[PDB]
Design a protein around this ligand. Sequence first.
Ligand SMILES: NC(=O)C1=CN([C@@H]2O[C@H](COP(=O)(O)OP(=O)(O)OC[C@H]3O[C@@H](n4cnc5c(N)ncnc54)[C@H](OP(=O)(O)O)[C@@H]3O)[C@@H](O)[C@H]2O)C=CC1
Ligand SMILES: NC(=O)C1=CN([C@@H]2O[C@H](COP(=O)(O)OP(=O)(O)OC[C@H]3O[C@@H](n4cnc5c(N)ncnc54)[C@H](OP(=O)(O)O)[C@@H]3O)[C@@H](O)[C@H]2O)C=CC1
Ligand SMILES: O=c1ccn([C@H]2C[C@H](O)[C@@H](COP(=O)(O)O)O2)c(=O)[nH]1
Ligand SMILES: O=c1ccn([C@H]2C[C@H](O)[C@@H](COP(=O)(O)O)O2)c(=O)[nH]1
Ligand SMILES: NC(=O)Nc1cccc(C(F)(F)F)c1
Lengths: 532, 534
Amino acid sequence: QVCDVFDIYAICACCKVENEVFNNYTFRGLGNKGVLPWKCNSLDMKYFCAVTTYVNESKYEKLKYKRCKYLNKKLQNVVVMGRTSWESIPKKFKPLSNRINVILSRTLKKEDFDEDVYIINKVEDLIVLLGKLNYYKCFIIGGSVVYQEFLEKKLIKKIYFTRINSTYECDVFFPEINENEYQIISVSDVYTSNNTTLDFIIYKKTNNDDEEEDDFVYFNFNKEKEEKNKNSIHPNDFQIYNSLKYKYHPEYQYLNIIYDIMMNGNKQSDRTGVGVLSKFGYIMKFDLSQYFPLLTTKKLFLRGIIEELLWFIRGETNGNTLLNKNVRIWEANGTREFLDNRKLFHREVNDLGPIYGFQWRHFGAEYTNMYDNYENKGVDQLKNIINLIKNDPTSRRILLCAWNVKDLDQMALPPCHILCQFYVFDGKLSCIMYQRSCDLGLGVPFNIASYSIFTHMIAQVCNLQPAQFIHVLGNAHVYNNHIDSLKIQLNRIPYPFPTLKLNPDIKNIEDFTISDFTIQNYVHHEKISMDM
Amino acid sequence: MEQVCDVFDIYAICACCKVENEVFNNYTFRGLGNKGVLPWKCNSLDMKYFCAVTTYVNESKYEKLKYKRCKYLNKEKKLQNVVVMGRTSWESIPKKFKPLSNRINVILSRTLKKEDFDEDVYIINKVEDLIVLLGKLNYYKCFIIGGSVVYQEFLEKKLIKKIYFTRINSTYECDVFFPEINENEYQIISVSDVYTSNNTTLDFIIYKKTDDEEEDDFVYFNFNKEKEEKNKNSIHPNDFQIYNSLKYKYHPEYQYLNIIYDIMMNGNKQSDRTGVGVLSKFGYIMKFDLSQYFPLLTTKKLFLRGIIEELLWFIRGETNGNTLLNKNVRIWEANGTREFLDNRKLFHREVNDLGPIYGFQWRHFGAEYTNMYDNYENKGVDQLKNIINLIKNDPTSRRILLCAWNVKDLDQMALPPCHILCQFYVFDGKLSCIMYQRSCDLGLGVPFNIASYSIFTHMIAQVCNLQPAQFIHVLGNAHVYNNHIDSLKIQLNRIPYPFPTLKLNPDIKNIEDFTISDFTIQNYVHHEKISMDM
Ligand SMILES: NC(=O)C1=CN([C@@H]2O[C@H](COP(=O)(O)OP(=O)(O)OC[C@H]3O[C@@H](n4cnc5c(N)ncnc54)[C@H](OP(=O)(O)O)[C@@H]3O)[C@@H](O)[C@H]2O)C=CC1
Ligand SMILES: NC(=O)C1=CN([C@@H]2O[C@H](COP(=O)(O)OP(=O)(O)OC[C@H]3O[C@@H](n4cnc5c(N)ncnc54)[C@H](OP(=O)(O)O)[C@@H]3O)[C@@H](O)[C@H]2O)C=CC1
Ligand SMILES: O=c1ccn([C@H]2C[C@H](O)[C@@H](COP(=O)(O)O)O2)c(=O)[nH]1
Ligand SMILES: O=c1ccn([C@H]2C[C@H](O)[C@@H](COP(=O)(O)O)O2)c(=O)[nH]1
Ligand SMILES: NC(=O)Nc1cccc(C(F)(F)F)c1
């Protein structure tokens, strides 16, 4: 077809516009009062400039040869804009350098601008110009109107589409791309620039020395499988996951582990007597300077997990404090029956024992009951790591450990979050967290969010910028009742990550309150129970 | 000129064992045959490599090679490789494997001609003759399969594009030897993973003779990034000439070596406790298949007596620096002096009383430490016994942890533990271990930490009646000390040898019952010793 031969791509950027339901169409703001709805965007004008200028000469022959057969017979690219589009560009910037500049304008002639700048009066009269020009690729660089007419006439091979994860005022939008006409094959890394997260996605038209290649196969002569889905999961079902080419979005660090356990997981009956797929040892790294890694492939609520962190920081072991705020994370572990079954016959219901908060603020003190004044009993690790970050940032001993071996049996249950280690470099703070037991379907999503918030909390009260939250999983498992749920999750394409704003006046780890925590521009898919 | 072996894609393949303070080089692996058969009887995994390499053909490349070969000579069923062997090698093949299946068998001989043979084989009497056969035949690649005379003369005439060479890491009686490869003529480019088969480790090395739509998407998506001056430390490429010149780096030792590279190139300049200076990064993961090898580094000489005496000393719950100095083991010496203890505020600590460190915490976690002479019978928690009981009776527990990081006791220790915690995992009668190291000296310490917990995984595996599987090493704050660098540069340009094996006296069935002579390291092949500051 036309768009395949003359390599007509489209490239854009769309912000959001004034429960919430989100979809691919949420990102559709192009222009306001002539200019872009956002101010500029250093990273986008970088991506745009590098896409529309990049050419591979030593790969043209294939395109001139093939573009000729169709018709019957310094290298550059084409940029097709509208007048309104062409006008809004400042003059300092025109024509767009190292680019063959075309302009759709009924009411303009070639005599009114320089020589190597083309004007065209209608759409089909570009096939003309491409047929008779020397170019690499033809980028449709916009107009609402220029995108609309060019897309609905199937003239577009791919759409290089930027997702600006922030709302602006808008007067012109992108057209509702049809998910049965185009599908996403590529999702880039998420980035901050000019005070917003953005990522880069690629839509493609649906179809309705080479010596050490062999060395590769020899060294692969021992691999275990030859299509027996290792476990009976059926790759077939997640066509969309398997159909993506580049999965650079950080959320795939999570999804790829779900994939890996499903596909290669060891079938096991666990302590619940219930059924898991388990592997051992994974790392995840999230860039807390670029984004806040709250999963987008399903809805996540963070009030509960924030109140639970504030409760840890206060040193509380009192289950009832959380139940009074309807945070029910710990409810099942405070009942007569659960504590009895832990042989804790002498323990008040909702007295969870010397768990996180107590170890954090009192490690080595003799646990009595959940109402004791423990003030100045045992070691305040939390106080200790905050002062080490501040006075000995280069210390390799900044750990916060909740696995007190003496106290485990006293605990409602031994912790899953064994320890945090901190690392300071150039006013930047990173945190490793080791988790001994990882429920990939229900737990780990929340766990990523908690320890990311904590990272910001520590960093802010130490006047450091947050850098990496690093997540080491020990026993990484998927309960069997989650599999049909997680397969739905794998086929959803992640949205750009929100940001977290902390109230910046808070400088004691002890002085935070729920209202000091704001998630910003959280775009998500609909809620799934991992559970029906 | 355009060489005969490139046109006709002539390769060699072989397997070499070692032969009856030694110095070690690639000429260690040189043993081909004995009394006419292989010195080892059958190595099945190597068998399977040999079959895989000598029968794989890729149809789509044939069209390019045929053209190339016609170009060279002036011309215009099912693709098979050619195999070429000495007459002695032909007779050493089992009758029922002759001729080699889905291969065109070419035999070299003078005593014998086509009439002396029943099988679908070509006889030639002359190396000349092979080039003529090859220019006549339709075939993918041509493989020289020995024996020694044949390897000798083909290599002699640089008729080999690459050698696919198998290092059998064991010693057998041998009458015939591979030629000493000239390193000007052939350099290594690739080295495989390491494996066990028929009671020996082996690896696979390769000597070399000295829709592009979704293709730009890749370049767009890498738009943003660091340059070659925002590759933080431009320490010189040239220094790692050998390491960068390798294409495939699948030998597990490269997990350790690649972390060194990454830290040397991306590392953060920091100061430290000693005041020395480090390149640092934060959070790495190494996995070692202890069922396929014992991951004792080969790029430098390592001795394991000290760290074995240290491990046993741990399991006994000892905190006594003298127990170790009396076995002439100096691992914990410096940490035990008057000056070091006084500087730790341990002014009431006897010299070489290292306090409630690993031993004490594995057997007595939560007990009040007194001195290194105290019987702590049934005080604190015996973690070691506890994790042994859990692996035996509750293998699916996600709570099989050993933890040395008693926060209570840190300041009372000579120094706080580097090795924070061990977690165990049981599937299918096999035992994996994760160890989290909070601070890691990539130069001096990690080499030994890898050995220490690998040995410990075997000890626990064995006394719980399970087989080893993976030791998994998580590095937290991972650092090269400045004055280790030059030494690490030399190491990185060394190619690993196949890992040794670890043998445990199997009679031992209680954790507390092992002694130094229950540990053998068989087949340690290694590069010359290095001092990490010079
Ligand atoms: N987000 C992004 O990536 C981009 C956003 N923008 C923003 O887009 C907005 C401008 O878009 P919108 O107003 O449509 O502007 P357009 O660029 O679509 O301009 C439309 C004009 O182009 C001409 N035109 C359209 N179709 C044809 C045709 N088939 N043949 C000949 N001429 C044709 C006419 O010009 P004439 O009047 O001369 O006949 C028409 O009125 C601005 O806010 C701009 O900043 C621009 C580029 C990229
Ligand atoms: N470890 C490994 O990878 C391998 C080991 N081996 C082992 O090596 C031993 C056998 O090899 P080794 O004794 O060298 O013997 P070879 O297999 O190399 O025997 C050489 C014989 O082949 C013929 N020959 C060789 N070159 C020529 C030539 N240029 N022109 C004509 N004939 C030629 C001659 O046969 P004739 O005398 O009959 O004229 C010669 O005596 C056995 O132990 C075997 O199992 C073999 C292959 C691989
Ligand atoms: O924050 C938490 C708490 C629990 N778990 C999971 C791990 C296991 O699935 C289960 C805890 O039970 P054990 O691992 O202790 O058996 O819940 C998490 O993933 N994260
Ligand atoms: O088993 C060990 C013990 C120590 N070290 C190194 C790490 C540091 O270089 C130093 C200890 O210093 P701190 O981490 O305690 O600051 O010893 C190791 O690499 N491995
Ligand atoms: N070629 C032959 O006759 N014997 C043989 C047996 C085993 C392995 C190999 C090797 F090529 F991998 F080394 C060769």
